[PDB]
Each structure stands twice: as C-alpha cells, then as structure tokens.
Design a protein around this nucleic acid. Structure first.
Lengths: 350, 336
DNA sequence: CTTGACAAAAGTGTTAAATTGTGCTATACTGGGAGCCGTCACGGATGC
DNA sequence: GCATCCGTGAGTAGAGGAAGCACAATTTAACACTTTTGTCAAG
C-alpha cells in the first residue's frame, strides 16, 4: 500500500524491500569486521548472492586440464594471478594450488620409476613426496584384486591431475593432533594445533587435511547477513521511536522545502505508532488467524454434491507448505532448498 | 516476478559433477556415516544425537535442541585422545560432502518433475516434493555396486512426487489405495471407449476390471471420486450472480418453526396444571422436560425416596387423566 | 406403596476381517512452457 | 518537469445456468455375555 509503512519506518525503498522480503538480496545486521573490495562493510548494506558468498566462504576456482597433458605446477605451490598452471589455461587468481585427481602415480623405489594407472574408482592414500615403507598402501580400491601396494621403500610422485583447484588460504603444517575440526571459524591468534605452537593469523574457515597433514584456513568472515521477513522483523524490533522522533524534528528546520516535506511524512507514521501504543514489529506475522468454519462452509447440496468456499483452498496451500518447511529444516537440507520453501511460504500468505 | 525462473537461475550456479567427483563424495558420505556409529559406541551417546551436533557445526550459526548443550557436547567429542579424534574429523567431512552431493543434483529433479504437471499441484510444489526424494536417495545410495547416481535416485524422486499427488491434490482426501483404484478405473473406460466407438456402460467396465467387480461397485466408486464445486463460481455472462446465492440454509430454525415450538410448550404447561403436584412432576422428570434428559424410574425414585415400581403406576395414571381432558378440549391434536 | 419375579433393551470384552498408512524399486537419464494489442482512459500521488 | 504506478466507472428485475507390491497399524463389525430396566401379578 503506497507508500509502505514498513519502508517509511526503516528508510527503505520499495524495490529494496521486495529484494529482501522475497529472497533476492541479503541485508547486513552485524558486519563482524568484514571488508569488501577494500571498503569495510557497514550495517543495513544490501549484498548480492555473489558478494555474500565471497565474504562468507572465500574465493576458489577449479581449472579442468585436458586429458594427457601434465600440470606445470607442483601440489601445494602458491601461484599468482595470470600465472599459467597448464600449457593451455592460466590461473585467474592468486592462492594455493591443489591436485584434485591424479590419474598416474609414479614411485621412485630404492633398490626405479614405476608408473601406475589410477581409475575413477580408485583413490590415492599417500601424499606427494612421501617416504612409503614396504607393505604400506599407496593406492586404494574397491576390490583388493586391483589394489596397488608398495613393493619397496621410496618417494611417491603424483602426476596428471584431472583438474587444479586454486584457493586463497593459509597452510599451517603440524605434527600432533589439531585443536580444531572442519567447518570451524577462527580469529587471529587462535590456537590451531601442537598446544599453541601453531596459531592462526587471519579470520577464516578451517578444514583439516589428513592426507597432507596440514591445516588450511580459507579466508572468510563470520558476517551476519539475512534475508526474508525474519531480517525485517529484527530491524523493526530494534527501533527506538523516541530517538527517531528527535532526529526527525531536527531535520524539520532545514531550509530546503523537499527535506522538510520528507521529514514530515516519516514523522507522521512515527507519531501514529507512539500515540496509539502499537508496536512496529506487529506488522510481521508469527501466527496466522483462521476464520470460523461456518463463514467458509462446506455444505452438501440438495442433490448430494458438495459446495465449498475459496478460502478453504487458500488455507490448505499454506498449511501444506508450512508442514513441508518443518520437515526440510529437521533434515538439514541445503540453503538453496530451504530458501525456495521460505519464498513459497511468503507468497502463500500473500 | 517469476518464482520459477528465479529458482532455475539459482540451481544453475552449481556445476554438474564428473564421474570422479561423484564417486569421491559418495565414499566420503559412506565413511562419514560409519565414523559416527563408532563414536556413539565409544562415547556411550545416542547416534542420532551425535549426528545432529556434527551437522549443526557444519551448517554454522545461521540455523535456528538448545545451543547451550551443543557446544558442551562438542567439547566432549574434542576431549578424546588422538586415537579417537580421527573419527570426529571423518564425520565432519562426510556431512560437508553430503551437502555438496545434494546441491549438484538439483537439475535431475527438475527434469523429472516437469512430466507431472496438470495433476492438481503447481510446478514449484512438485519440485520441492521431488527434492525430498533426492535427499532420501543420498542416504541409501551405495557406490560399491558401480552404478551411477541417477540410475538409483530416479526411483526415489518419482516416488516422492507420486505420493505427494495422492495426498494433497484433493480437498476431500482419499487414501492412497483408493486413489489407485480410481486411476485404474479411468484407464479401463478409456480403452473400452476407443474399442466400442461409444461410452461403455457400467457392466462393460466391471467385466474388464476383473473378479470382485460388478456394476454396483463401479457406480459407487465413481460417486466417491466427485470433487466439490466452488461457492464463488459465476453463472451467466455478467459477474453479479454466483452459486452461493441459490443455496438455502437448513440448520437454523425458521421463524415459523420457532413459534410453534413455544406455542406447544405453553399449551402443554396448561394441561399439566390439571394434574396434581407430584403427578405432573414425575411426568416431567420421566419425559425429560426439566433437565432436558429423561431419568430412570429408579432415578425419580431416589429424588422422592420411593421404589422403582411406584413410579410406573403413578406416571401411567397421569397419562390417563391427560388423555381424558384432551378428548374434551381438542386443544392439543393440531401440534401432533 | 412394597415384594417376588420375567423378558428385554442396553452395555461390555473378545476377536476376525476390512481398511488404511508406509517403505521400497540399482542401465542411464541433470534449467519450464504458454503466450500472442481496437493492449481502456483519466486523475491522483510518488519519485526522480 | 516528467516517468511510473494504482484505483475508479447508475439502479431494480429476469432466466439460463498417470505403478505397483509387501506388510505393519489401525478401524470396524460380529458375537456372545453380563447387567440394567421396564411390565405383570399380587397384595
């Protein structure tokens, strides 16, 4: 209803309100010391989907190598933007390079460069440049008939990766048990492993590699940005109507006619809420009332056929979507599926 | 504006997995499930409880059991020595792999769901019901058999969509087995119609359905399968007339019926005045005029302190006096 | 008004049979489909 | 000064108008039997 009462209180445009309410953009509620493009992130700032993931998860990209060709970059080597990883493709960002699926494993025995072919159903269990004693597994397999084991002691070399993953992170070698696990978030100075010997130097998400026995901290922030009516309800609950009224009264003295006209329209909505006693956050529904059944009847006509009102079908749609969302939340569904359900629930209420 | 296009744009940001990528994630999920079971055995906790704690950490703080006990239990898992801490790491990586495997197969459900439109559910409702089948397939998938994921997941995605149609597409819900009978009955009549060159009778339909079917059972099933009609459906060209304007209400009594009820009560009270004090009072208790409900001969006896059989003769005597007066006045026959 | 009756109408387990609710299926399959101009004309309110 | 969005347009009457299957849970019906409740005859 033009102009929107929620938009007037929160100082949000009509198009900005639709993007948040219907899950198209995020809004920042707690920046948590995040910097975007060299500019720190402030509250009430609208983020796109690409911007949010970059801040929350970090940068990485996978480059698929053509079959047969071999990478010019060793595993675990820091690279730069524009540096060519393969003879045909180049890296578009700077970070650590990792092997994804080495198709051939070459071991230098001590007595001898034997070559082993690795199938998609086989996974290598030892890291590159690892001194592997006789009898230790080198490549694992589903069926032990095709499994490859170590004939003699030597150094294992990896070659022909399926693709190269470049991720902006920090690598911390360790020897003892780690203090954190995959999916945790750390701050500079936090202990990582070896009883304080290794400590993180940057915010980020930590994943623990057991094959390479190293700790990686993918550079990201614990930023608090949310979508939907749950984010709008958070902002409306934190409003101080008394403090907003005093600010608007000061803007009422501006020489410009336009400034005084805009401050008066915001003040009129604020004054109505202060005098009536209503709360601004009551404009977001938590419980939906249901009409009595006799005003939306289901009656049997004289011939035996049934007649029903349209309100019954509109209630049934909302209940079905509300129940499905509960089951999806209890199953730990990914955020893409959850966001779709929430967008359908808002439209059902509308 | 278009919710369908927004969803298709979002699922297009997750690239399709390769054969090597598909196998590695499935192995990680299978190993992650195995590591959780061992931890519950070692720690003496409920396996369903440990999985929730591990799942909560992976999903982060952006998800609304209280978190005061989640972090405390996490310390218990991390307080184990190195020999037992490996199972914790394997469990964490498995749940992350499970999330990636689900998101990479969201195009498969879309291609299946487009073949079920026009059957009582919207396209976005079919997609969300098919997403639940995809989640179940990840749990039960086995990568040792060397079959691809889409071979097995297609069974589970179709089942969820088909079951959701049979449970939500009708205002008056019909059980799953009865829905299948209605669908089979419609297929049979369509086949006979193109063979006979005309609409079949109920006797032809019953014979083709098989044993246990006669024309009466065919007619009853067709009567069950009728959908209610809307009260707001218009009739005519101009939009000022609707179905609901021609349906009378027959629950509330009419003004005529309300008045004859009170006229009868007033005449019945004047007749009872000719009786004695107890003869009338016993009659009212037995017939249920005071409390609204009748009382047993014994119940009336307990009210006055008298036996059961005494009530029968005194109640019968009052009736004889009423019949005698009634024949002399004819003020009570019209109400009958 | 109180006893002995007397069958009857109603109440109470017990159990077999209809009826209903639910899980499962292993070749491989991975971004929708209908629209489609005598598009109604004019005033008011908002945002640039 | 102008582009974009949104709500408004007389009354009464009529008269037609596309999956299976296996199996576990649950509900219902049938059937006896026990108990309660009127009638009848006294008295």
């Amino acid at each position: 209803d033009v102009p929107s009462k929620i938009g007037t209180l929160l100082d949000l445009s009509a198009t900005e309100l639709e993007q948040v309410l219907y899950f198209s953009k995020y809004i920042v509620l707690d920046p948590k010391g995040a910097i975007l493009n060299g500019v720190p992130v402030e509250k009430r700032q609208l983020l796109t989907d690409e911007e949010y993931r970059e801040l929350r998860y970090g940068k990485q990209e996978t480059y698929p190598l053509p079959p047969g060709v071999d990478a010019l970059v060793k595993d675990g080597e820091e690279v730069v933007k524009g540096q060519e990883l393969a003879p045909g493709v180049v890296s578009r960002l700077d970070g650590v390079a990792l092997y994804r699926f080495p198709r051939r494993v070459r071991v230098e025995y001590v007595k001898e460069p034997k070559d082993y072919r690795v199938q998609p159903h086989m996974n290598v269990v030892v890291p590159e440049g690892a001194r592997v004693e006789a009898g230790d597994k080198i490549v694992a397999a589903i069926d032990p008939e095709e499994e490859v084991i170590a004939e003699a002691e030597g150094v294992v070399h990896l070659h022909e990766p399926a693709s190269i993953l470049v991720v902006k992170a920090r690598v911390y070698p360790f020897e003892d048990d780690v203090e954190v696990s995959t999916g945790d978030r750390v701050a500079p100075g936090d202990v990582l492993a070896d009883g304080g010997k290794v400590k993180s130097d940057v915010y980020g998400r930590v994943e623990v590699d057991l094959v390479r026995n190293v700790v990686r901290v993918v550079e990201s922030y614990d930023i608090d940005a949310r979508m939907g009516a749950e984010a709008i309800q958070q902002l409306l609950k934190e409003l101080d109507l008394e403090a907003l009224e005093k600010e608007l009264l000061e803007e009422m003295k501006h020489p410009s006619r336009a400034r005084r006209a805009k401050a008066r329209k915001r003040l009129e909505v604020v004054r109505a809420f202060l005098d009536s006693g209503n709360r601004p956050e009551w404009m977001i529904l938590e419980a939906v009332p249901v009409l009595p059944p006799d005003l939306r009847p289901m009656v049997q006509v004289d011939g035996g056929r049934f007649a029903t009102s349209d309100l019954n079908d509109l209630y049934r749609r909302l209940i079905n979507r509300n129940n499905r969302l509960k089951k999806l939340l209890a199953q730990g569904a990914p955020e893409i599926i959850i966001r779709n359900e929430k967008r359908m629930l808002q439209e059902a209420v509308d | 504006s278009d919710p369908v296009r927004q969803y298709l744009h979002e699922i297009g940001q997750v690239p399709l997995l390769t054969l090597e990528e598909e196998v590695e994630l499935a192995r990680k999920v299978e190993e992650g499930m195995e590591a959780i079971k061992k931890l519950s055995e070692i720690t003496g906790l409920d396996p369903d409880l440990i999985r929730e704690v591990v799942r909560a950490k992976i999903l982060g703080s952006a998800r609304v059991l209280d978190p005061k006990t989640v972090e405390e239990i996490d310390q218990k898992l991390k307080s184990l020595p190195k020999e037992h801490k490996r199972y914790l790491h394997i469990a964490r990586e498995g749940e992350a792999a499970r999330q990636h495997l689900i998101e990479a197969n969201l195009r498969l459900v879309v291609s299946i769901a487009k073949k079920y439109t026009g059957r009582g559910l919207s396209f976005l409702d079919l997609i969300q019901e098919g997403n639940q089948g995809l989640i179940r397939a990840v749990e039960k998938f086995e990568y040792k058999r060397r079959f691809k994921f889409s071979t097995y997941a297609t069974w589970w995605i179709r089942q969820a969509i088909n079951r959701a149609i049979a449970d939500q597409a009708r205002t008056i819900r019909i059980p799953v087995h009865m829905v299948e009978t209605i669908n089979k009955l419609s297929r049979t009549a369509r086949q006979l119609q193109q063979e006979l060159g005309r609409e079949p009778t109920y006797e032809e339909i019953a014979e083709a359905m098989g044993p246990g079917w006669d024309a009466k059972r065919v007619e009853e099933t067709l009567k069950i399968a009728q959908e209610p009609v809307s009260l707001e459906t218009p009739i005519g060209d101009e939009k000022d007339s609707f179905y609901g304007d021609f349906i009378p209400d027959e629950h509330l009594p009419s003004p005529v019926d309300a008045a004859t009820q009170s006229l009868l009560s007033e005449e019945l009270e004047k007749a009872l005045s000719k009786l004695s004090e107890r003869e009338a009072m016993v009659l009212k208790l037995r017939k249920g005029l005071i409390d609204g409900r009748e009382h047993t001969l014994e119940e009336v006896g307990a009210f006055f302190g008298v036996t059961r059989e005494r009530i029968r003769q005194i109640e019968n005597k009052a009736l004889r006096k009423l019949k005698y007066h009634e024949s002399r006045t004819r003020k009570l026959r019209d109400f009958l």
